[PDB]
């Protein structure tokens, strides 16, 4: 009788409450199902950006290569101070050379004066 | 007894529906769980791979150092063609030199013949 | 009889269902959170990737360093040649020295000659 109509009253109340929870549950699963797929795309985007970075790195030059170069550069820099000295030796060998040419033209002229004297002397002596 | 029966029927239909909805929820839920654990695995791997790239990046050369080297190299190259006309000046000095060497020996040769002819003049004088 | 027995069943199915729902709620909640973590982790990763992309925009390519390496080995090959030349300076310096010497040899021979001649000029005027 009414014990039944109370169990039924309880049974309906539970059922209605169960229905609200399911609706609310379904909603939540939709919220999370959508996020997890936006995450799956966000992470497949990233792993492909990273394979680009991995690649774009296989292209950038080592640091050891560029520290060899800065050594070999400073090596050649120093060799330029070893063979910058023998530039001012040229400007010194040209002025001395020139001096030597001047003295040589002066020596020649003395010889030609001398030769003229000796021509004179050989004549004076045969004229006796 | 035929209102208690109508409500009971309403419940049996409602229960069957709720059961069917719960089966939908479970497998749906399962899949979001399955997918979210992938996304987690994917995002931590990517984390590892991002790290790897951060290190590799650290072993590559900063452009500014490579740009230094370029400039230094060019300024070395500047002061190297600069010392090509140094040796241009040499080839003139070497020839100008051998022109002086050939003179000096001729000068000597005229001088030796002068000496001889003086020795002659002197001997000619004493005998008179 | 036959009402009481359906109601009995119904109450057992409700209880069964209440457990399924309370189990479902913590599954969902767990998965919700795991996805909120996944979401931030993947947003962070994209920020880190985006620091690596910006650190790649401050490094030199292989081509440019390869170039520098060639430019250098040239300047080594170009110098080394020129280095062999400039030993020809040392040759002019000592040869100039020998000359300087031969000239002072010559200059002094001449002065002794001038002297002899000065005497001869006089001796011939003395006849
Ligand atoms: Cl997720
Ligand atoms: Cl370099
Ligand atoms: Cl260099
Ligand atoms: Cl990610
Ligand atoms: Cl990266």
Numbering used by the authors:
A (entry chain C), B (entry chain B): 104 to 231
C (entry chain A): 105 to 231
Task: Reproduce passages from the article.
α-Helical coiled coils are ubiquitous protein domains, found in a wide range of structural and functional contexts. The structure of coiled coils is understood at a level unrivaled by any other fold. They consist of at least two α-helices, wound into superhelical bundles and held together by a mostly hydrophobic core. The seven positions in a heptad are labeled a – g, where positions a and d are oriented towards the core of the bundle and are thus mostly hydrophobic. We find that they indeed break the α-helices to form short β-strands, which associate into a triangular supersecondary structure we name the β-layer. β-Layers are found, also repetitively, in natural coiled coils, where they form regular fibers with alternating α- and β-structure, a protein fold that has not been described so far.
As part of that study, we identified a putative TAA in Actinobacillus actinomycetemcomitans, OMP100, which carries insertions of 2 and of 3 residues within the heptad repeats of its stalk. The insertion of 2 residues extends a heptad to the 9-residue motif IENKADKAD and occurs between three N-terminal and two C-terminal heptads carrying N@d layers; the insertion of 3 residues is directly downstream. For structural characterization, we therefore expressed residues 133Q-198K, covering the two insertions and the five N@d layers, fused N- and C-terminally to the trimeric form of the GCN4 leucine zipper, GCN4-pII. The construct yielded a typical α-helical CD spectrum and, upon heating, unfolded cooperatively with a transition midpoint at 91°C. We obtained crystals in space group C2 that diffracted to a resolution of 2.3 Å, with one symmetric trimer in the asymmetric unit. The structure showed a continuous heptad coiled coil with two discontinuities. However, the insertion of 2 residues led to a sharp break in the coiled coil: In the middle of the IENKADKAD motif, the three chains of the trimer cross each other to form a triangular plane perpendicular to the coiled-coil axis. Thereby only the central three residues of the motif, KAD, deviate from α-helical structure. All three fall into the β region of the Ramachandran plot, but only the central residue, alanine, forms backbone hydrogen bonds with the alanine residues of the other chains. We call this structural element a β-layer. Here it directly connects two α-helical segments, where the C-terminal one is rotated counterclockwise by ~120° around the trimer axis, as viewed from the N-terminus.
